[PDB]
T-cell receptor, first 110, second 111 residues
């Protein structure tokens, strides 16, 4: 088993870039795919990144996923922030007998 | 290209067994693994079921995943219902390689 640790929240201005990171506590981050989910409270989550850095159809190119083996973390970078981007972001990966989610990062667009 | 439709709300008394459906709009429900996530207020989702009926350790056997091919859907059944089970439940599967989520179901324990 392992944990995916990410900041409770982060704030940034519209038009700017923000990076939300997810650190895996044990085992190598590159051991399994990392997904990034966007959820606006009251609605189901939406996949913005799957398999570390692949954006599904219909997701703006302003979203990009990356993996950093040196820090054993995954990052979601959102450029040109739009108000609509305000939402909670959860990273997720696979362990052995479970799917583990990060605590989620509340992104506030000032 | 498909959607995973679930009932918006479901309610049941404590102690009883509640079933939450997840219906795939197109393509066989059994052609890709279905996961079930439990999301309590202001917190992160947790996996209660993965690969159709697998329970990670920690999750009570009170939760069970199943597949009904006649209604092309997956179901999460929760027995010994407790007020603590109240939360939003999301089913999830794969379209190509993308992760598709169900609309979600608000489970209220009328108790």
């Amino acid at each position: 088993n392992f944990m995916l640790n990410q900041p409770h929240s982060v704030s940034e201005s519209p038009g700017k870039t923000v990076t939300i990171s997810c650190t895996r506590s044990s085992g190598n981050i590159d051991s399994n795919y990392v997904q990034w989910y966007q959820q606006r409270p009251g609605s189901a989550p939406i996949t913005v990144i799957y398999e570390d850095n692949q954006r599904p159809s219909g997701v703006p190119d302003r979203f990009a996923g990356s993996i950093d083996r040196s820090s054993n973390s995954a990052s979601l970078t959102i450029s040109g922030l739009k108000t609509e981007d305000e939402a909670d972001y959860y990273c997720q990966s696979y362990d052995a007998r479970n799917v583990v989610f990060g605590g989620g990062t509340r992104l506030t667009v000032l | 290209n498909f959607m995973l439709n679930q009932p918006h709300s479901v309610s049941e008394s404590p102690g009883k067994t509640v079933t939450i459906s997840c219906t795939r709009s197109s393509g066989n429900i059994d052609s890709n693994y279905v996961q079930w996530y439990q999301q309590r207020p202001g917190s992160a989702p947790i996996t209660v079921i993965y690969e159709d009926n697998q329970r990670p350790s920690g999750v009570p056997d009170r939760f069970a995943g199943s597949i009904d091919r006649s209604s092309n859907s997956a179901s999460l059944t929760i027995s010994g219902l407790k007020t603590e089970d109240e939360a939003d439940y999301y089913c999830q599967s794969y379209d190509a390689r993308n992760v598709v989520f169900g609309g979600g179901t608000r489970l209220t324990v009328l108790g």
